[PDB]
Amino acid sequence: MVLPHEPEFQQAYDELVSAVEDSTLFKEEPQYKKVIPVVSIPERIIQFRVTWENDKGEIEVNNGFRVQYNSALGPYKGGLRFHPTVNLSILKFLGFEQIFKNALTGLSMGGGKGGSDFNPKNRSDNEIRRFCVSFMRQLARYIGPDTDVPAGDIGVGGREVGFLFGAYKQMRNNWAGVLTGKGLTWGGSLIRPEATGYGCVYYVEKMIEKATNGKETFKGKRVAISGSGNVAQYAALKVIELGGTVVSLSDSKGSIISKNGITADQVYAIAAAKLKFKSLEEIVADSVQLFSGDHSVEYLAGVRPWTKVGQVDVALPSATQNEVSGEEAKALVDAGCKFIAEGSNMGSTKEAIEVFEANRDSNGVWYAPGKAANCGGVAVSGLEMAQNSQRVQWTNEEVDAKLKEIMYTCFENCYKTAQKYSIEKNENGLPSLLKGANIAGFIKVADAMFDQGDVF
Amino acid sequence: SHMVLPHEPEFQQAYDELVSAVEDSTLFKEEPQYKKVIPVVSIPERIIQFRVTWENDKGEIEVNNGFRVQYNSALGPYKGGLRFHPTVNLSILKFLGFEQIFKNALTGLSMGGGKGGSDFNPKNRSDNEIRRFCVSFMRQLARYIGPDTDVPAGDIGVGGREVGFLFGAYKQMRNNWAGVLTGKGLTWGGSLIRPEATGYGCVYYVEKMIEKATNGKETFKGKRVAISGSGNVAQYAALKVIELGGTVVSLSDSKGSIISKNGITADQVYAIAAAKLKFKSLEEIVADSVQLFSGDHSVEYLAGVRPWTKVGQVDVALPSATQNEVSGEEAKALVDAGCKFIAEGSNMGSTKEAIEVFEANRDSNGVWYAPGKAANCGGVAVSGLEMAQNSQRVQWTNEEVDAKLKEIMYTCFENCYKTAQKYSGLPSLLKGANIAGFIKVADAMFDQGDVF
Amino acid sequence: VLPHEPEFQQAYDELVSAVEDSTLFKEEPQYKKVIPVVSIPERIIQFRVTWENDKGEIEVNNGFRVQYNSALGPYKGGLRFHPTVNLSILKFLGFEQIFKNALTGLSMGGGKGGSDFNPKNRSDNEIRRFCVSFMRQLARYIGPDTDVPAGDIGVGGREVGFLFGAYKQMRNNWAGVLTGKGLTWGGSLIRPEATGYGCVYYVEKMIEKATNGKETFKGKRVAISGSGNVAQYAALKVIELGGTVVSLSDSKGSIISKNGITADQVYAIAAAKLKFKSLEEIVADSVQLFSGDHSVEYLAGVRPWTKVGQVDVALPSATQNEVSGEEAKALVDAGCKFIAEGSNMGSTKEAIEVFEANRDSNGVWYAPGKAANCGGVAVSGLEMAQNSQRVQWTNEEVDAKLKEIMYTCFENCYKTAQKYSIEKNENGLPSLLKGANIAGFIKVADAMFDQGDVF
Amino acid sequence: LPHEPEFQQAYDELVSAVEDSTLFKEEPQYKKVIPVVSIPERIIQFRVTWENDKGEIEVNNGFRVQYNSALGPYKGGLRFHPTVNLSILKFLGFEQIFKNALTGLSMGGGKGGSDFNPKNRSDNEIRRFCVSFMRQLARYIGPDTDVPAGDIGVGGREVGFLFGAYKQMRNNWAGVLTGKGLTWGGSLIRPEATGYGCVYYVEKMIEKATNGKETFKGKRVAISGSGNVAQYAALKVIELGGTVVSLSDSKGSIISKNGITADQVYAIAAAKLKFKSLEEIVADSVQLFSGDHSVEYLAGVRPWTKVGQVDVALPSATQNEVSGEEAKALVDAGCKFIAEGSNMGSTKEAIEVFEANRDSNGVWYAPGKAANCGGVAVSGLEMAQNSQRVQWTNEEVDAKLKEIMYTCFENCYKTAQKYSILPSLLKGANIAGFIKVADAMFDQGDVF
Numbered sequence A: 001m002v003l004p005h006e007p008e009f010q011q012a013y014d015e016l017v018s019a020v021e022d023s024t025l026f027k028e029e030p031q032y033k034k035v036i037p038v039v040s041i042p043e044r045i046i047q048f049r050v051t052w053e054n055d056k057g058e059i060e061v062n063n064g065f066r067v068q069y070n071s072a073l074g075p076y077k078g079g080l081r082f083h084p085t086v087n088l089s090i091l092k093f094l095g096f097e098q099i100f101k102n103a104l105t106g107l108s109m110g111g112g113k114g115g116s117d118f119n120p121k122n123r124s125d126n127e128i129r130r131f132c133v134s135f136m137r138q139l140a141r142y143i144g145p146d147t148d149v150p151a152g153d154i155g156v157g158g159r160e161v162g163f164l165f166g167a168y169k170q171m172r173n174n175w176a177g178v179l180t181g182k183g184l185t186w187g188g189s190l191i192r193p194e195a196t197g198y199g200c201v202y203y204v205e206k207m208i209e210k211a212t213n214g215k216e217t218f219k220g221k222r223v224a225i226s227g228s229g230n231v232a233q234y235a236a237l238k239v240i241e242l243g244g245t246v247v248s249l250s251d252s253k254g255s256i257i258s259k260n261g262i263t264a265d266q267v268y269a270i271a272a273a274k275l276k277f278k279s280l281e282e283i284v285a286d287s288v289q290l291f292s293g294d295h296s297v298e299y300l301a302g303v304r305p306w307t308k309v310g311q312v313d314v315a316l317p318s319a320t321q322n323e324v325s326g327e328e329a330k331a332l333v334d335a336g337c338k339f340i341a342e343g344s345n346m347g348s349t350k351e352a353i354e355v356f357e358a359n360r361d362s363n364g365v366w367y368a369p370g371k372a373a374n375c376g377g378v379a380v381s382g383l384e385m386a387q388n389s390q391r392v393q394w395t396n397e398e399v400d401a402k403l404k405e406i407m408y409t410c411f412e413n414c415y416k417t418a419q420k421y422s423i424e425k426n427e428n429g430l431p432s433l434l435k436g437a438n439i440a441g442f443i444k445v446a447d448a449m450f451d452q453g454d455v456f
Numbered sequence B: 001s002h003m004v005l006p007h008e009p010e011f012q013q014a015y016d017e018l019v020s021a022v023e024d025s026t027l028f029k030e031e032p033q034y035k036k037v038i039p040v041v042s043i044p045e046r047i048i049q050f051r052v053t054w055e056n057d058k059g060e061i062e063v064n065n066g067f068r069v070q071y072n073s074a075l076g077p078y079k080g081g082l083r084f085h086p087t088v089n090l091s092i093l094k095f096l097g098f099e100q101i102f103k104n105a106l107t108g109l110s111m112g113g114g115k116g117g118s119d120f121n122p123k124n125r126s127d128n129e130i131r132r133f134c135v136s137f138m139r140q141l142a143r144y145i146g147p148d149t150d151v152p153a154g155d156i157g158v159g160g161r162e163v164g165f166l167f168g169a170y171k172q173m174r175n176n177w178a179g180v181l182t183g184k185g186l187t188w189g190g191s192l193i194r195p196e197a198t199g200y201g202c203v204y205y206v207e208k209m210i211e212k213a214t215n216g217k218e219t220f221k222g223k224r225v226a227i228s229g230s231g232n233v234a235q236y237a238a239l240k241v242i243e244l245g246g247t248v249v250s251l252s253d254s255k256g257s258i259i260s261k262n263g264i265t266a267d268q269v270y271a272i273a274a275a276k277l278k279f280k281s282l283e284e285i286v287a288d289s290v291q292l293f294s295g296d297h298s299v300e301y302l303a304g305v306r307p308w309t310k311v312g313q314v315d316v317a318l319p320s321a322t323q324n325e326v327s328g329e330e331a332k333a334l335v336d337a338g339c340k341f342i343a344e345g346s347n348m349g350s351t352k353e354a355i356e357v358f359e360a361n362r363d364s365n366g367v368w369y370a371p372g373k374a375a376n377c378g379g380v381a382v383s384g385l386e387m388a389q390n391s392q393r394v395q396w397t398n399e400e401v402d403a404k405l406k407e408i409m410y411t412c413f414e415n416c417y418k419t420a421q422k423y424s425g426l427p428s429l430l431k432g433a434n435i436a437g438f439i440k441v442a443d444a445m446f447d448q449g450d451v452f
Numbered sequence C: 001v002l003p004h005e006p007e008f009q010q011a012y013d014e015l016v017s018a019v020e021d022s023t024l025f026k027e028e029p030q031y032k033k034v035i036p037v038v039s040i041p042e043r044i045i046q047f048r049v050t051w052e053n054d055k056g057e058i059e060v061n062n063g064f065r066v067q068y069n070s071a072l073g074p075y076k077g078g079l080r081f082h083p084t085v086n087l088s089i090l091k092f093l094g095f096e097q098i099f100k101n102a103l104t105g106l107s108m109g110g111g112k113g114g115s116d117f118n119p120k121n122r123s124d125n126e127i128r129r130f131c132v133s134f135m136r137q138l139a140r141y142i143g144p145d146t147d148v149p150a151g152d153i154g155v156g157g158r159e160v161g162f163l164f165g166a167y168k169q170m171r172n173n174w175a176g177v178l179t180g181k182g183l184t185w186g187g188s189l190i191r192p193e194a195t196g197y198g199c200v201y202y203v204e205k206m207i208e209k210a211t212n213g214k215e216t217f218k219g220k221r222v223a224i225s226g227s228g229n230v231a232q233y234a235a236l237k238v239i240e241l242g243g244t245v246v247s248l249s250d251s252k253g254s255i256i257s258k259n260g261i262t263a264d265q266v267y268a269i270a271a272a273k274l275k276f277k278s279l280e281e282i283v284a285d286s287v288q289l290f291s292g293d294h295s296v297e298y299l300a301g302v303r304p305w306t307k308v309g310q311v312d313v314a315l316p317s318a319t320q321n322e323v324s325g326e327e328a329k330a331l332v333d334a335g336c337k338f339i340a341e342g343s344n345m346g347s348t349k350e351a352i353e354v355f356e357a358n359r360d361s362n363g364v365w366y367a368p369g370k371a372a373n374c375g376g377v378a379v380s381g382l383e384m385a386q387n388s389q390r391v392q393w394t395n396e397e398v399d400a401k402l403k404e405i406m407y408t409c410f411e412n413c414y415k416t417a418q419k420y421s422i423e424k425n426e427n428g429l430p431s432l433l434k435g436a437n438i439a440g441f442i443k444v445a446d447a448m449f450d451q452g453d454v455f
Numbered sequence D: 001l002p003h004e005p006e007f008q009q010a011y012d013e014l015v016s017a018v019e020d021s022t023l024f025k026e027e028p029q030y031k032k033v034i035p036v037v038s039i040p041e042r043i044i045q046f047r048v049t050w051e052n053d054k055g056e057i058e059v060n061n062g063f064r065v066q067y068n069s070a071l072g073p074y075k076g077g078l079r080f081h082p083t084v085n086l087s088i089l090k091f092l093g094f095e096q097i098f099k100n101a102l103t104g105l106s107m108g109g110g111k112g113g114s115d116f117n118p119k120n121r122s123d124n125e126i127r128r129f130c131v132s133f134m135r136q137l138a139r140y141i142g143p144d145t146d147v148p149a150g151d152i153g154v155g156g157r158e159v160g161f162l163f164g165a166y167k168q169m170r171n172n173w174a175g176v177l178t179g180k181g182l183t184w185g186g187s188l189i190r191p192e193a194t195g196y197g198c199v200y201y202v203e204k205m206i207e208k209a210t211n212g213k214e215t216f217k218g219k220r221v222a223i224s225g226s227g228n229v230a231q232y233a234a235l236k237v238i239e240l241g242g243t244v245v246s247l248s249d250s251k252g253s254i255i256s257k258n259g260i261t262a263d264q265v266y267a268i269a270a271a272k273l274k275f276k277s278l279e280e281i282v283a284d285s286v287q288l289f290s291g292d293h294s295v296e297y298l299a300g301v302r303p304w305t306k307v308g309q310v311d312v313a314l315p316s317a318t319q320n321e322v323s324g325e326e327a328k329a330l331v332d333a334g335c336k337f338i339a340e341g342s343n344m345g346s347t348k349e350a351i352e353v354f355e356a357n358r359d360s361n362g363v364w365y366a367p368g369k370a371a372n373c374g375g376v377a378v379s380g381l382e383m384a385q386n387s388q389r390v391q392w393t394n395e396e397v398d399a400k401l402k403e404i405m406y407t408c409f410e411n412c413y414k415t416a417q418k419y420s421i422l423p424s425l426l427k428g429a430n431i432a433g434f435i436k437v438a439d440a441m442f443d444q445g446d447v448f
């Protein structure tokens, strides 16, 4: 009646809260009970009209948001999303996620997220540029390299980051790390494109190693991936590089499934075309030869790939929120899936997580939440901030190694934390990475909040 | 693409009222360019939400949500009050700021549209808790306001005490002394008619309404006036009605109404004001002052009831409490009781149904409704006069501010009347106010490139 | 351990004892909470001021700005360039300024600043370099809505001009950041005369109330100390009103006459003091003006109070602690019935004790500086109003506003002293000291409570 | 000028160290510097209004002295103690200028604090005060302007409350303060920094004085105070094989002969966090301070005279905590090495005694601005980590601290020798810092 209905935010909130209460944490230190109703209310939200001009010279209006959620661990850090579904609820769920994700990267980065209900698809680069300019001119006053460092997300990539950076510099007359994901010649980092997907696959590497005592790797594993964006493209490429077989990709209109695995050239063509806002249907149509040989793929319109891949070992939802239903989760378990890790933010529904966790101690089915598995993107963003602040640019190998080490440490932190605060430690079984990640992030943020007087 | 925007019923009510007043006129046909403005002006230029953390008297941590909606800055810096009330959310404050744009436009002063507040509840709370909350609030807010950017003021739950605490917090954070807020204390930049402003202005507007409706043959002399609420607006509306020879037949608050038949007296309003400063109920106020409410000026307290149906024959109604406090049925009850003049002291005091009833009785039973964005604009007008006094480094006399308020209210009535007639018995002041304010704001937005 | 600050403690004790010896804390005890808050300045700024003299050598001085209280408005106060300047003196001055400004009825906070830099007998080039250095250290912390300084001892129109230029060069803004500005770049017309004219207007109202309009300044002997802006224009107003100015003084000696100092003598003193001349040197340089029927006796190293015989009015207009208890007794014995400070805290506690002890018996009426000399800051506030309105008022308009401000101040002192007196003598003069202190304190304290500065 | 005895003490010490040398004769331009550098660039005093747990209004004085910024942004701690006044903070900031100069880092001089007393006060009252203080102060500091830190009465808890207040007012997350928590931008050796650095400096002192024939091995070391400086100086002395014969606090001293143990220091630290006296801590943990490692508590007395034969003395408590009589008592007790963990720990009389016995009895005195510069050095290393957006390992920071302290020792020795007439480490440190700061002031046009 008073508070507005914000279901996605409430979903993320409930996931974290139920992970924290279902543990020994409040018993061992009840002071943490004070923290939940404070950290969950954002330090600041900024909504603004974004007025711009389309190619016909008509006036267009969209809503722009920047949610600066938590700054205990550092300046606000988070991506920007341009998608017609964007509202305060979605951005609140994303920023709440981001707080504890950033806590898991071990770098000094606060939580935030922003975007607009602007729809960039099938739009000219001129219209995108005008909207980014107007948007950043509305936002510039409230961000800065020590205050709030946005980046990309759905609908926001290198092109959009470039337009935004230029607009910011024209308004504020500063050249600094006000954004991450910048171009390599004007302050970018080398592994930032690959970061999220590579990090997800590294995290699943460590998962597999722990689950099989080093007896299995990504070697010969069937991997079902959703989405076809930055996360999905580079997760697929790393799975291919590590000897797995990528059996699926998807987008907003359908899925593509193969049985022998998607090839790297196919991912490259998909990436190039997705830059041009092509559907997977249109790309399998445009490159008939490339998607028809021994590496042919079947395009299934209107369907998510989880049920359409048969036996599968690993599942990497890498598209959007709530893209794995309870039904799809049960189907994955029945199809032999033993590793599910979100490259997307809150990719799994509450029901999917219930299924995965209920199959954990019995079928060895191991689920890792996005705030742990996909934190490589913000991790390498923070590394870009480090390079910018140091006025240096690191090599490919240096950033990749730091990314690998950050992902592995995050896995170990999830595992050991889940063990430390488990109510009944079922030995010969796998501890909850969900609970582990949520509790580790919460403890770090809450300790810092106490220290700084944000809670008492 | 579906159901993205959050549910904001109060904002949509204000929006629909203004839009339907603008569409049902010759305005879009005579100049269709105005059609471009509705979807731009209706999206606020800027909104700021912030956590307000404070400490209660036990040393416990309390958390509330704070908002400042800076809606439109075409005609001047953002101008609007602050509301501390447990119902506060983005929707209510958006409706209030959207209203405020065109209200401020009707005052003829250079004032943009805005509004703010928090779901903090000050009722029965110590002045220490109020002070701590105001400090935390203003510390989160100051960075975004200024005497040339955004000049907040009071509203429900925010009066002189809260404005003072907020001003102190602002001065400590920003190290400047200026008209960053209106409704300030007289010794540190306030104006003399600002407390009285809203109710006095409502009564002045209804003065001009009655004069036009009766060709100067009737005044407030001997009129039965039903007022709701017992706050700043209602108190001073009642006092002005008394001074003008009317009989105030009712007041109310969140728990019940009080009704009289000889009229409420000025001493009764003074006692109610003093007691409401300490968060007393009207029930408790008639209990605590038995002598004052029992003679020929006795009052009956009706718990849980609004005064509209409980007053018998009534000539004028001044809802001066909150939004949506006059139902369609209560509007019919007023019409049946002979009510011919209705002017909102509160913001959006009438439901859409009540406005439909009054307008449907306009040409036939001569029932004349005036919306809040016209009638209660005296408060923000005298706020702007406070801003002018601050900018000039002067303080005006009682009569100077009272006269400027009077002329602004009368000019507002004349503008509503002429505009209602120009784009169409008694003309609809609802349409008049909405269209006049809309035209002024939209011309300024066109001139400044906010719309093209 | 608190540092020794005698001048500040003097002003503090004066105000505190005026408020305690009244019905005030009985009528509203909440005010007791305000004394230990308001008496600690909101902010103090100390800074090194490095400059270059005419030989091209580096000189170093201390610069201060004490921003004491901002409840009633932005910090308002003058700047003093004098070698005795330290934090203690400026704290007393800014503390004074709080309640003085409160009495002017304008929106003005309390503050004061300056430097131990000594401008006497120094070239205009050295003064310009020092003003530039000083204002560049200070500008970051002042502004037309934050802190509006002006002149004082050692700082006049020339120094205000250099300061305004340096500020405009650093901050790139043209606004009322200072008062006492030149007429062509944002100044006001009565500001030079303001303090002395207002002091004499206050004594006008004093005489009127004390004698039921039967006496005026007509035919009164008036002893003035000092020879600066306050003293010059107080003397000119006394002359214009038909009185006889029997003395002036400076840091080296006094000048005494028996027919009264003339306006032309005052003009010459002003012109020569602009060039840092002593009274000895000015009576030597203009022998023609100081030798006829208007001859003058120069007494080196002496204050004029004991050296004038019978005198009716005394206007100390030079510096702090310039009337000792002995000089107060001498003035009482010489028949003085009106004493009003043109300088800030001109009288020692002993002198005030003498005057107050003779109030109800000999009708001897003392008015403190925070009431009597508030005309200067009042017209400075009017300069701020003119700048804010982008208008400049006529001579007569500002002079009239000054007169009404001074009269309002006297009436407030009188009525406030009577309202809260525990002397309760039907007959007798009420304490203007207590009146001014209590009225100013009440206004400032109410504002502090409203704004949450005290709770 | 107002009476400022502590500032004048520090000023006179530095000036007499510089004048009693060949410096002004070799290059007389330095004569212009003393009356400039000794006047602080800027001082900010402000009322700090706060609210106690009873809801009553409390008022205190807050100061920030930004003394000299030639070598970098102002760097200095914050002291909450009822004795705080402008004189004390001026003495500390004047010291800090040349201390920072000796650390070889880009750090100006400054110091601040309040007469607020944190003793026996609830964490809520401390948080409210820190909030009021930092909200009054933030406008004048910044990661490139003035980076405060802790001192007496201000530790990790207070640094946390202050950092929160600053971030809430200025909306920036950066290295505006040092001594921050490890999880929000802190450094790994910062707690240990000052005492560890003092002990490393005395390592090099002993080494130079005996040509490497002696170390801290088997030496009697008398420590005063029981705060951060004293705690970690004691821990480093223990780790290096010395015997800690004493500690002290504001109420009395504790003395033993078998050496203070690490567990005892840990308990003292935990209890001092709750504002317990040494009397109360030896009472509350009788087992830990009465067994084979028992300790004798002498109330109201400084430990220097109550420890018998002693080799090293580390005053680690406050200013003017070693009198001339106590200096003679230490010399007679066989002390040959004295290094101040506190700022201006020794009185003029104690320093005169030590220097007068230097060339004859080989007693070596090192001033605090050289010996205790490890704390501000690791503060600067925290600043470097923040600016780089990195956090270093324990070993990395410990090694950088060690090398900085050793470099400072060599600079003291070499500079004392270059301009003299065992060399005086006092004059060495003072002259090295003065030369660096003065050259920088000349270059930037602060002196001409």
Ligand SMILES: NC(=O)C1=CN([C@@H]2O[C@H](COP(=O)(O)OP(=O)(O)OC[C@H]3O[C@@H](n4cnc5c(N)ncnc54)[C@H](OP(=O)(O)O)[C@@H]3O)[C@@H](O)[C@H]2O)C=CC1
Residues within 6 Å of the ligand: A079, A085, A152, A153, A154, A155, A156, A196, A227, A228, A229, A230, A231, A232, A250, A251, A252, A253, A274, A279, A318, A319, A320, A321, A343, A344, A345, A346, A374, A375, A377, A378
């Ligand atoms: N980019 C980064 O660095 C980071 C991204 N993430 C998370 O990964 C997920 C995707 O990121 P990213 O690769 O950058 O996004 P992209 O814009 O690169 O692509 C997103 C993919 O998801 C699909 N998709 C988008 N919207 C919907 C929808 N409403 N319903 C169904 N499918 C949809 C898109 O299909 P189509 O192309 O047809 O529109 C596209 O295939 C998000 O949850 C994001 O927050 C997490 C960490 C960092």
Ligand SMILES: NC(=O)C1=CN([C@@H]2O[C@H](COP(=O)(O)OP(=O)(O)OC[C@H]3O[C@@H](n4cnc5c(N)ncnc54)[C@H](OP(=O)(O)O)[C@@H]3O)[C@@H](O)[C@H]2O)C=CC1
Residues within 6 Å of the ligand: B087, B154, B155, B156, B157, B158, B198, B229, B230, B231, B232, B233, B234, B252, B253, B254, B255, B276, B281, B320, B321, B322, B323, B345, B346, B347, B348, B376, B377, B379, B380
């Ligand atoms: N103050 C001003 O200058 C201006 C005010 N207004 C409008 O006037 C109306 C009230 O103004 P104001 O006098 O300042 O407010 P006040 O706080 O002084 O009092 C408001 C009155 O309305 C009653 N009331 C408040 N909320 C509710 C509710 N949710 N349900 C039922 N009754 C309620 C209150 O009852 P109770 O005392 O029991 O809480 C109180 O009597 C608002 O619509 C405001 O926006 C318009 C122009 C300017």
Ligand SMILES: NC(=O)C1=CN([C@@H]2O[C@H](COP(=O)(O)OP(=O)(O)OC[C@H]3O[C@@H](n4cnc5c(N)ncnc54)[C@H](OP(=O)(O)O)[C@@H]3O)[C@@H](O)[C@H]2O)C=CC1
Residues within 6 Å of the ligand: C078, C084, C151, C152, C153, C154, C155, C195, C226, C227, C228, C229, C230, C231, C249, C250, C251, C252, C273, C277, C278, C279, C317, C318, C319, C320, C342, C343, C344, C373, C374, C376, C377
């Ligand atoms: N100027 C203004 O607008 C205001 C001034 N006042 C107060 O009035 C007094 C003087 O003001 P103003 O006329 O403008 O100042 P000026 O600089 O114009 O002159 C001050 C006069 O007092 C003499 N004098 C100054 N200091 C001392 C001293 N320490 N000991 C002895 N004699 C001294 C000077 O003598 P000489 O120069 O010949 O050596 C000079 O004649 C001060 O107390 C000031 O605070 C109050 C209100 C406003």
Ligand SMILES: NC(=O)C1=CN([C@@H]2O[C@H](COP(=O)(O)OP(=O)(O)OC[C@H]3O[C@@H](n4cnc5c(N)ncnc54)[C@H](OP(=O)(O)O)[C@@H]3O)[C@@H](O)[C@H]2O)C=CC1
Residues within 6 Å of the ligand: D150, D151, D152, D153, D154, D194, D225, D226, D227, D228, D229, D230, D248, D249, D250, D251, D272, D276, D277, D316, D317, D318, D319, D341, D342, D343, D372, D373, D375, D376
């Ligand atoms: N902290 C740092 O990094 C650095 C510190 N220093 C200097 O070291 C000294 C202490 O620092 P720190 O350890 O952090 O402070 P702490 O507040 O942690 O403790 C200081 C110790 O000295 C005692 N003490 C404090 N004041 C007095 C006094 N007036 N008279 C006698 N004994 C007293 C205290 O006793 P009790 O607890 O009972 O009050 C406590 O045992 C200061 O002079 C400081 O300037 C120098 C370089 C850096």
Ligand SMILES: O=C(O)CCC(=O)C(=O)O
Residues within 6 Å of the ligand: A077, A078, A079, A080, A098, A101, A149, A150, A151, A152, A153, A180, A345, A374, A375, A377, A378, A379, A381
């Ligand atoms: O790079 C960042 O700022 C965060 C990346 C991102 O979009 C996320 O973690 O959700």
Ligand SMILES: O=C(O)CCC(=O)C(=O)O
Residues within 6 Å of the ligand: B079, B080, B081, B100, B103, B152, B153, B154, B155, B182, B347, B376, B377, B379, B380, B381, B382, B383, B384
């Ligand atoms: O600005 C003011 O005077 C209060 C504004 C307000 O709430 C109104 O006019 O309805």
Ligand SMILES: O=C(O)CCC(=O)C(=O)O
Residues within 6 Å of the ligand: C076, C077, C078, C079, C097, C100, C148, C149, C150, C151, C152, C179, C344, C374, C376, C377, C380
């Ligand atoms: O003009 C001002 O700002 C103050 C004038 C002055 O010198 C004083 O009142 O002390």
Ligand SMILES: O=C(O)CCC(=O)C(=O)O
Residues within 6 Å of the ligand: D075, D076, D077, D078, D096, D099, D148, D149, D150, D151, D178, D343, D372, D373, D375, D376, D377, D379, D380
């Ligand atoms: O460590 C710091 O940064 C402040 C300096 C200090 O406390 C000291 O060395 O005395």
